[PDB]
């Protein structure tokens, strides 16, 4: 036996596995149970800590994926299948994973905690693009990821009720963070140096832990990639959450009050709920998801926008950023005229129709304001400009401007913020050229996937991945990504400085689409209230 | 004895003129021809009556009085403002017109240019030196007519529905002069079947209203609108707001001893000295502002059967040629009349607080949300507080809202509905300009080049500017003769709703460009009206 892969945590003994890397081995402990399986009567309930066990838990392989919708838009296409579950689906899915260097560190090592995205309806810690072996070998930190409930199982809410309080998927993450505080030292980790990082809904999850006091004490630094808690998609109001929960029950034959409604939902197989998940949305749209965190005064005592404005953020360091073309990926899921298999050169009529699906549940006047700002009135009908304009609409509304607002408010209120735009299109990208650098395609570089010899990244891209891993790990260690070389300056509300990340050296630029984001963050709210 | 070239007979009687000297040769001028009975005493606020025939010879040898009006006092003695102030005595006896014709009189019918001065409908006169018609007539051999029309309350005080003060009588003054041209211009060698209206500022808005009034439309064939349009937010007023302003003016001068019977109210107003009415003219505006004037044309269903925008959108304009344009910096002149932080004597590098305050003065009587939309669009959010950018932004706000975007909307609708449109932007700053450099090419300072003022030997224009003026006079006269400013050489393409082509007018040859501030004017012409409705 290998003593380096035997660990005793508070709940019992674990057996890990030795993983290979072009730079040397790492230790991995995969599929560690941190909660009781939320099954049967425990569906929709907050998680319970895992009860202690006898014997040795086999922690050599990833555990099941939390039950979720499986994408079918392009069957077999690499660009979509890389996000689909690669393990069996189960409601018994509350497991986390620990990667440590080999041999295990004898000194307290900074910890990075990954929260995957997936619009709160999908995702898994077992996806190949989240493989932590290269980060842990290159930068010598402890790396933790957890699975958390998604879709109705994690975020269906009958607000006020005890049978379905909502946000339990977020409590899954918090419980894993508490598990890290109690057990990460047994792997060589330092519980006093924990950096949360996540992408898309994971970034929105990270931001929500920043704004929830019970979570705030479980970590010390935060990285938000292409997501923010204050977007128009990451939260839902109590009334709309209740309406969606009620319509789901109707679509699955329930009831035969909240107590009875939830009891009937608990009798339905997991797939039955998944099969009707998308039909509770109020309208045809993109970048909208059925069951997301709810603002009910508990996990979030107020809206994330209100909490960001009222918060004291001195002593907080955050790393935030976006990719160059945040919106293009979502357009093929419903904007008329868009497809991965052609140039998607849409007409003005399709552009106007696409604005309503990309900015759903918005008055006609506010939609007209969007069309005004995003039309080039010297070329109002040029298909290529319209394709790009609609990508900018979806991307600015949902990612760039929510992130810009978060960064500006945190910086103006005591936090040290570092901002980036990711501008390298991977040579291996399977999405068409017109999508540019699409949403989510900086992750593989952050995790050092180009170092995998089994893949076809260039030598320049391997250098690039090592650069990014160093930035991220420097920030985890010191709150500053810079190597003590062109310097990465902090983002401020006035100067609005960020850096571009690509094969070229760091270049400092001004403004995260300041013109467009003034519209979304300053004017549009004023219009909607009148 | 007498010179036969300076003696002409019109329908009303005989006239005697004068021989003007110009650097290029003699011109015949008939200045101060009465075309209406003096609108004095009981005739104040009433539509004009045609001039009764006279015996003997009327001496049309000098400009007549300026219609009673407010006199600017912002910069006393300053050349930049005094050039617009009355250069003749003020009087309500002011309904006279002027005719310039070549010497000797043309043998064949000659195209006619009719000038309508601006002045915000509260000021102006055809006697101003910058409107001197001798150079145009000499250089291009046209006949030029200009008329005086009543301004201020005397021309546009309206109690709608009352016959005592129906409103728009200043526009009826212009129409009567146009009817006079139809009946009498052939006696001067003019062709009544080739008449081109042209005007600037409120004169351009007047030209546009004649285009949209059927009784006026038959009196001319072509139109030139310089830095003005009838659809601006300042050129017309609703019936109720006209009545509120008229009622408030009478109240401020003691009439009646508020509102009540219209006949008695107007009769009380007619007993007031003309200066007393002028002394309170500016006090009836609903808010402090710039580019807003108290007594302007009223949309009452008569002269204008609807708003100018509705008439423009519903009009068939086939068979019409129009020449429209603006100067490069339309807003700057108006900012020193009330925007906080602005003066001709300093750089006017305003603060953000002064910019935000200026938006409410420059876009008056709109909701807080509408003002926020203006601030969003005209702020550079990468440099939100730089004084120089704020100064230029407020100038653009006032210029786009009041001139550029109204002109662009008119041009686009006319072109899309059968008219042929030629558009320009005037971009030359005169070497003799007295306004400070930060105002650029200000509103109104293309007029002197179109009238050929640089050819005046007493003035100090460069040789290039004299060539420039001669080129502009040729464009205008070519349009008057043929409906096309091009020489029968860089070509001036028509303006269309799609291509939106216009030319730059300056010392360089013609350069073709696209879009009259297309991005800005989409906000003013497409979005903002939808916001005001909700
Ligand atoms: C680009 O393609 C989209 C989607 O078409 C799909 O992909 C093609 C490669 C082919 O497999 C089609 O059969 C697919 O439907 C086009 O948008 C569609 O247009 C058709 C009419 O041709 C219409 O019936 C569908 O409803 C449209 N789909 C959507 C989602 O709006 C689009 O027109 C193409 N762009 C071009 C040709 O410029
Ligand atoms: C509004 O008043 C006019 C004028 O009233 C006349 O003049 C006043 C000074 C006073 O002397 C009144 O007694 C006068 O009647 C009215 O128009 C007059 O109406 C009467 C009866 O027809 C008569 O004097 C003449 O017809 C009109 N004289 C005018 C026009 O000078 C008018 O009817 C009143 N309108 C209303 C709605 O009351
Ligand atoms: C620029 O000037 C304006 C106007 O001031 C006038 O013009 C100056 C050149 C000088 O001749 C002054 O004596 C004149 O009064 C300034 O705006 C005024 O500022 C004063 C003092 O702060 C204030 O009382 C007035 O209300 C202001 N007037 C307006 C219309 O706003 C402005 O401050 C000057 N800007 C500078 C000096 O940077
Ligand atoms: C919910 O409804 C059931 C059936 O009507 C009833 O028996 C039960 O008491 C209710 N529970 C609550 C908490 O209201
Ligand atoms: C032109 O300049 C001369 C001096 O060179 C001056 O005497 C004359 O008054 C000026 N004419 C103007 C300003 O019209
Ligand atoms: C995991 C990254 N992906 C899929 C590409 C998404 C959708 N992230 P995020 O939840 O966008 C809302
Ligand atoms: C005659 C030119 N001027 C004076 C500069 C004006 C104000 N013209 P317009 O009537 O402006 C609304």
From Swiss-Prot, chain A:
EC class (word): hydrolase
Mutation effect (residue 326 to A): Loss of activity
Annotated catalysed reactions: acetylcholine + H2O = choline + acetate + H(+)
Entry annotation: catalytic residues: 200, 326, 439
Mutation effect (residue 172 to N): Misfolding, absence of secretion
Membrane topology summary: Peripheral membrane protein
GO cellular component: basement membrane; cell surface; extracellular region; extracellular space; Golgi apparatus; membrane; neuromuscular junction; nucleus
Chief place of localization: other
InterPro entries: AB_hydrolase_fold, AChE-related_enzymes, AChE_tetra, CarbesteraseB, Carboxylesterase_B_AS, Carboxylesterase_B_CS, Cholinesterase
Binding site for huprine W: 119, 200, 431, 439
GO biological process: acetylcholine catabolic process; acetylcholine catabolic process in synaptic cleft; acetylcholine receptor signaling pathway; amyloid precursor protein metabolic process; cell adhesion; negative regulation of synaptic transmission, cholinergic; nervous system development; osteoblast development
MF term (GO), any: cholinesterase activity
Positions annotated to bind galanthamine: 83, 199-200, 329
Disulfide links within the chain: 66-93, 254-264, 401-517
E.C. designation(s): 3.1.1.7
Compartments where located: Synapse; Secreted; Cell membrane
Sites carrying sugar chains: 257, 342, 456
Keywords carried by this UniProt record: Blood group antigen, Cell membrane, Disulfide bond, Glycoprotein, GPI-anchor, Hydrolase, Lipoprotein, Membrane, Neurotransmitter degradation, Nucleus, Secreted, Serine esterase, Signal, Synapse
Binding locations of huperzine A: 83, 130, 329
Tissue expression per record: Isoform H is highly expressed in erythrocytes.
Family: Belongs to the type-B carboxylesterase/lipase family.
PANTHER family the UniProt entry points to: ACETYLCHOLINESTERASE
Protein name, as recorded: Acetylcholinesterase
The encoding gene: ACHE
């Amino acid at each position: 036996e290998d003593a380096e892969l035997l660990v005793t945590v508070r709940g019992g003994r674990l057996r890990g596995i030795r993983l290979k890397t072009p730079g040397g081995p790492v230790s991995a402990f995969l599929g560690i149970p941190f909660a009781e399986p939320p099954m049967g009567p425990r569906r929709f309930l907050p998680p319970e800590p895992k009860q202690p066990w006898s014997g040795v838990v086999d922690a050599t392989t990833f555990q099941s994926v939390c039950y979720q919708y499986v994408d079918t838009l392009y069957p077999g296409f690499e660009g979509t299948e890389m996000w689909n579950p690669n393990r069996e689906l189960s409601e018994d899915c509350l497991y986390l994973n620990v990667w440590t260097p080999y041999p295990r560190p004898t000194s307290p090592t900074p910890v990075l905690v990954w929260i995957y995205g997936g619009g709160f309806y999908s995702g898994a810690s077992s996806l190949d693009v989240y493989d932590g072996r290269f980060l842990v070998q290159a930068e010598r930190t402890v790396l933790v990821s957890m699975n958390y409930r998604v879709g109705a199982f994690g975020f269906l809410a009958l607000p006020g009720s005890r049978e379905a309080p909502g946000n339990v998927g977020l409590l899954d993450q918090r419980l894993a963070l508490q598990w890290v505080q109690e057990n990460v030292a047994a792997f060589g980790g330092d519980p006093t140096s924990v950096t949360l990082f996540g992408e898309s809904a994971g970034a929105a999850s990270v931001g929500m832990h920043l704004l929830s006091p019970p979570s705030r004490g479980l970590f010390h630094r935060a990285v938000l990639q292409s997501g923010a808690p204050n977007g128009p998609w990451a939260t839902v109001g109590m009334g709309e959450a209740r309406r969606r929960a009620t319509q789901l029950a109707h679509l699955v034959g329930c009831p035969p009050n909240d107590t009875e409604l939830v009891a009937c939902l608990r009798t339905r197989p997991a797939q039955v709920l998944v099969n009707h998940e998308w039909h509770v949305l109020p309208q045809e749209s993109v970048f909208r998801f059925s069951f997301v965190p709810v603002v009910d005064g508990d996990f979030l005592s107020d809206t994330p926008e209100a909490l960001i404005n009222a918060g004291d953020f001195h002593g907080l360091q955050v790393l935030v950023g976006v990719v160059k073309d945040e919106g293009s990926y979502f357009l093929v899921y419903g904007a008329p005229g868009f497809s991965k298999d052609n140039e998607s050169l849409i007409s003005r009529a399709e552009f106007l129709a696409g604005v309503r699906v990309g900015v759903p549940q918005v008055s006609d006047l506010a939609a007209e304001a969007v069309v005004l700002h995003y039309t080039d009135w010297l070329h109002p009908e040029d298909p290529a400009r319209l394709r790009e304009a609609l990508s900018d609409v979806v991307g600015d509304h949902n990612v760039v401007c929510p992130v810009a607002q978060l960064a500006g408010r945190l910086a103006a209120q005591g936090a040290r913020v570092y901002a980036y735009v990711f501008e390298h299109r991977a040579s291996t990208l399977s999405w068409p050229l017109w999508m540019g650098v699409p949403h989510g395609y900086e992750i593989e570089f952050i995790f050092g996937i180009p170092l995998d010899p089994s893949r076809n990244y260039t030598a320049e891209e391997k250098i690039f991945a090592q650069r990014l891993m160093r930035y991220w790990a420097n920030f985890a260690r010191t709150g500053d990504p810079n190597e003590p070389a062109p310097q990465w300056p902090p983002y401020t509300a006035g100067a609005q400085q960020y850096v571009s990340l690509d094969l070229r050296p760091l270049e400092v630029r001004r403004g995260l689409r300041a013109q467009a984001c003034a519209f979304w963050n300053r004017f549009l709210p004023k219009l909607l209230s009148a």
